[PDB]
Amino acid sequence: SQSIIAYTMSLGVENSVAYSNNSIAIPTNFTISVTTEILPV
Amino acid sequence: QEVFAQVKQIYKTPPIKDFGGFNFSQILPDPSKPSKRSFIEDLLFNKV
Amino acid sequence: SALLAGTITSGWTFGAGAALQIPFAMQMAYRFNGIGVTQNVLYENQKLIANQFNSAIGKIQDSLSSTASALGKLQDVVNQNAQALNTLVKQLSSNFG
Amino acid sequence: SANLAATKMSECVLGQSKRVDFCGKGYHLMSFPQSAPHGVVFLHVTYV
Amino acid sequence: SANLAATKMSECVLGQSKRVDFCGKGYHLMSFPQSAPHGVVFLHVTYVPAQEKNFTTAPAICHDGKAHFPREGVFVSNGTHWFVTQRNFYEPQIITTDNTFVSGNCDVVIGIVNNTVYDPLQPELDSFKEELDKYFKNHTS
Amino acid sequence: TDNTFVSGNCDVVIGIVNNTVYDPLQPELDSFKEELDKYFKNHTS
Amino acid sequence: SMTKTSVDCTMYICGDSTECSNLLLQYGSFCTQLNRALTGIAVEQDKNT
Known part of the structure; x- marks a missing residue:
């Protein structure tokens, strides 16, 4: 019971970042990630 | 795609604006317009 | 608007990772430390810098409104397309021998 | 021009570039992109 | 693409590039090149933050009447005491004279808060004063 | 002490070696300590 | 920059002849x-300098 559906392009999750004079965010943890960049020569 | 959209997360402007004395309303979009554009983008579209 | 709303709030944080909320007054303090300027200049001159930035944006709005040739870089792209599309159509009328 | 705009979109706008005469005349601080027909307009804030 | 690959080979692999979105998303560390047919594959090691926590910040610390600015990092607080930590990671430290520098006064910076700037010379001299007091008690005894 | 900084402990570092960190404030207080101890000898006189 | 060159379309194809010019307009x-x-x-090339 599946078919092809058409819909408006979504630009991703909409998130409103809080902003204030005395508000600040510092990371308490980190992650070491490895990516891949492929270029022709 | 390589220029306009860098990230996949949409960010919004807070309703209460205190920037420390700076006015960004020129570069920020105006929701009252039928098409979404800023005060600078309004001139960029009319001159082309 | 997504890149502007983030740069005003998160600054340089959301580009290399998760967005970190920072006040924009403290973001220029790090941007001055990158060019070799002590952040003491910002907090003291913040009122003077406010008149420098707000007037500079007003000059851009006046320059774009009064001078319409500053965008000619993009107008050339439209002109190159116009000259290319029109020429390809006008060649249909030529006899080509 | 797109690859050059994409490079200046990441370095000048998202981050802070120390390159000379890359983000524009002066010591670069922040860059504000603006939508324009068939292109993009950058507003470069610099320290002179 | 070859000039771009040679640029990434130089900056990302050999050295360390501070360019954003050049060596890949996140803060670059080291790049490992890999041979590939009719091209090259770059394996980049990046530094990305994971968990975040909301803190309370202030632009300056008012102690003796003169403002204090952080030398490296920003001011953070959990709601009780003001801490100094780097932007890349959270390492809470006590506000000291070596971690800050005295410039301006408390009436200029907007948002300055009152706190006590720790001076490491004070307890060192207090322990030196108590050390001489132990010798003074030995002469009287 | 001025060339280094105190962080963590010795157990969390892999390969740490033991040495004596020169305290730049130690001889400055010891130089005055010799003169201040002379007053202790004058108190007994 | 490189050498600035300009080529006249008429004189390059054929010189001093009005018969070929009529065939060139076609x-x-x-x-x-x-x-x-x-x-x-x-x-x-002048913008490069």
């Missing part, structure tokens, strides 16, 4: 497109 804007291209090169 081929359309080929002269216009090749002249504007070489003219644009001479301008871009």
Whole structure:
């Protein structure tokens, strides 16, 4: 019971970042990630 | 795609604006317009 | 608007990772430390810098409104397309021998 | 021009570039992109 | 693409590039090149933050009447005491004279808060004063 | 002490070696300590 | 920058002849497109300096 559906392009999750004079965010943890960049020569 | 959209997360402007004395309303979009554009983008579209 | 709303709030944080909320007054303090300027200049001159930035944006709005040739870089792209599309159509009328 | 705009979109706008005469005349601080027909307009804030 | 690959080979692999979105998303560390047919594959090691926590910040610390600015990092607080930590990671430290520098006064910076700037010379001299007091008690005894 | 900084402990570092960190404030207080101890000898006189 | 070159479409194809020029007009804007291209090169080579 599946078919092809058409819909408006979504630009991703909409998130409103809080902003204030005395508000600040510092990371308490980190992650070491490895990516891949492929270029022709 | 390589220029306009860098990230996949949409960010919004807070309703209460205190920037420390700076006015960004020129570069920020105006929701009252039928098409979404800023005060600078309004001139960029009319001159082309 | 997504890149502007983030740069005003998160600054340089959301580009290399998760967005970190920072006040924009403290973001220029790090941007001055990158060019070799002590952040003491910002907090003291913040009122003077406010008149420098707000007037500079007003000059851009006046320059774009009064001078319409500053965008000619993009107008050339439209002109190159116009000259290319029109020429390809006008060649249909030529006899080509 | 797109690859050059994409490079200046990441370095000048998202981050802070120390390159000379890359983000524009002066010591670069922040860059504000603006939508324009068939292109993009950058507003470069610099320290002179 | 070859000039771009040679640029990434130089900056990302050999050295360390501070360019954003050049060596890949996140803060670059080291790049490992890999041979590939009719091209090259770059394996980049990046530094990305994971968990975040909301803190309370202030632009300056008012102690003796003169403002204090952080030398490296920003001011953070959990709601009780003001801490100094780097932007890349959270390492809470006590506000000291070596971690800050005295410039301006408390009436200029907007948002300055009152706190006590720790001076490491004070307890060192207090322990030196108590050390001489132990010798003074030995002469009287 | 001025060339280094105190962080963590010795157990969390892999390969740490033991040495004596020169305290730049130690001889400055010891130089005055010799003169201040002379007053202790004058108190007994 | 490189050497600035400009080529006249009429004189290059055929000189001092009005018969071939009438046969050249039947081929359309080929002269216009090749002249504007070489003219644009001479301008871009000056922009490089």
